[PDB]
C-alpha cells in the first residue's frame, strides 16, 4: 500500500494538503513529502475523478494546484498589425493550473497566488 | 489628420468602440474601419498611457475588458508541453474560458495593464490605423 497518510490509485499515491502555498513552493514541498513526489498530474479523467473526490472528502470545497506551470509563457504572442513584440505591460507574469474540488475541470490562476494542493508519486 | 471620430497620437489614428465582439470579430471589424486597420497595438509606455486615457474617457459603463491586438497566434489551450513530473500533456479538460490566450485592458488597473483573458468573451475595443 501507499504510506498511511496517502491514498492509492492505479499504482500511484496521492495526498491533499490544506496549507496554502504558491505554485512553485507547493511543487517543491511535494518533492520533499516522498521520493519522486510532485504536484498531482492528471493523465486521465478517471484519475482526476479520484483526486477530486479525495480532495473534497478530506478538505471539502476549495482550490488545489495541479502540476502545470507557466502555461502561456512559451506561446507565440503576436500583434495583429504584425508589429514585433518588444514593449511589455503584462499584469501577471505567469499562470498555473488548478482544480476546484467540485469537479475535474482545469482552471487557471496566477502562479504567485496561494492555493491548497495535492501531491503525487509513483509507488 | 485623422478622420472625424478618431483620435491622433504619434502620427497614428485610434478609435474606441463600445461594441461587444469576440477578439476575432473585433479584429476583423477594425480591418474594415480603415485601410490598414487592426486592433490597437501598444508598443511603448507613451502609447500605453495615451490608450489608457482614451479608453478611460471613451469606453465607460461597459463593465468589461477592452481588447488589444496582442494574442497567441495558435488556439492551443496551453503552450507548456510538460507536467512537473516530466510527462507530456496528452490529456486536457479545460473550461474554455479558463484558457486565457488573449489580452485586454481593465478599469481596475487603469486600462494600463494587459490582463490575460479568454478570446471568446465579447468585449469593447480600440482600433488603430
Ligand atoms: Ca498523474
Ligand atoms: Ca500601435
UniProtKB/Swiss-Prot annotation, chain A:
Disulfide bonds join 2-13, 30-119, 96-111. GO terms for cellular component: extracellular region. Belongs to the snaclec family. This is Snaclec coagulation factor IX/factor X-binding protein subunit B. The chain holds residues 24 to 146 of 146 of the full protein. It is found in: Secreted. Keywords: Blood coagulation cascade inhibiting toxin, Calcium, Disulfide bond, Hemostasis impairing toxin, Metal-binding, Secreted, Signal, Toxin. It comes from the Eukaryota. Residues 1-123 form the C-type lectin domain. One of its GO terms (molecular function) is calcium ion binding. Expressed by the venom gland. Heterodimer with subunit A of IX/X-bp or IX-bp; disulfide-linked. Calcium is required for ligand binding. When linked to subunit A of IX/X-bp, anticoagulant protein which binds to the gamma-carboxyglutamic acid-domain regions of factors IX (F9) and factor X (10) in the presence of calcium with a 1 to 1 stoichiometry. When linked to subunit A of IX-bp, anticoagulant protein which binds to the gamma-carboxyglutamic acid-domain regions of factor IX (but not to factor X) in the presence of calcium with a 1 to 1 stoichiometry. It comes from Protobothrops flavoviridis. Ca(2+) binds at residues 41, 43, 47, 120. Its main location: secreted. The keyword Disulfide bond applies.
Curated annotation (Swiss-Prot), chain B:
Keywords: Blood coagulation cascade inhibiting toxin, Calcium, Disulfide bond, Hemostasis impairing toxin, Metal-binding, Secreted, Toxin. It is found in: Secreted. PANTHER family: MANNOSE, PHOSPHOLIPASE, LECTIN RECEPTOR RELATED (PTHR22803). It holds the Pfam family Lectin_C. Residues 1-129 form the C-type lectin domain. One of its GO terms (molecular function) is toxin activity. The keyword Disulfide bond applies. This is Snaclec coagulation factor IX-binding protein subunit A. Belongs to the snaclec family.
Amino acid at each position: 500500500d501507499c504510506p498511511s497518510d496517502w491514498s492509492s490509485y492505479e499504482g500511484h499515491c496521492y495526498k491533499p494538503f490544506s496549507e496554502p502555498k504558491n505554485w512553485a513552493d507547493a511543487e517543491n514541498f511535494c518533492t520533499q513529502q516522498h521520493a519522486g513526489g510532485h504536484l498531482v498530474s492528471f493523465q486521465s479523467s478517471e484519475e482526476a475523478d479520484f483526486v477530486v473526490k479525495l480532495a473534497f472528502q478530506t478538505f471539502g470545497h476549495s482550490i488545489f494546484w495541479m502540476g502545470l506551470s507557466n502555461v502561456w509563457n512559451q506561446c507565440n504572442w503576436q500583434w495583429s498589425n504584425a508589429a514585433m513584440l518588444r514593449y511589455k505591460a503584462w499584469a501577471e507574469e505567469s499562470y498555473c493550473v488548478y482544480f476546484k474540488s467540485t469537479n475535474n475541470k482545469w482552471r487557471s490562476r496566477a502562479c504567485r497566488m496561494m492555493a491548497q494542493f495535492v501531491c503525487e508519486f509513483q509507488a | 489628420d485623422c478622420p472625424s471620430g478618431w483620435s491622433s497620437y504619434e502620427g497614428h489614428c485610434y478609435k474606441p468602440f463600445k461594441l461587444y465582439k469576440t477578439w476575432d470579430d473585433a479584429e476583423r471589424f477594425c480591418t474594415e474601419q480603415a485601410k490598414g486597420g487592426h486592433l490597437v497595438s501598444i508598443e511603448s509606455a507613451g502609447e500605453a498611457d495615451f490608450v489608457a486615457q482614451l479608453v478611460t474617457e471613451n469606453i465607460q459603463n461597459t463593465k468589461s475588458y477592452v481588447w488589444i491586438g496582442l494574442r497567441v497566434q495558435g488556439k492551443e489551450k496551453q503552450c507548456s508541453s510538460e507536467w512537473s513530473d516530466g510527462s507530456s500533456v496528452s490529456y486536457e479538460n479545460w473550461i474554455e474560458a479558463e484558457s486565457k490566450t488573449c489580452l485586454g485592458l481593465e478599469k481596475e488597473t487603469g486600462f494600463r495593464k494587459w490582463v490575460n483573458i479568454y478570446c471568446g468573451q465579447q468585449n469593447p475595443f480600440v482600433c488603430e490605423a
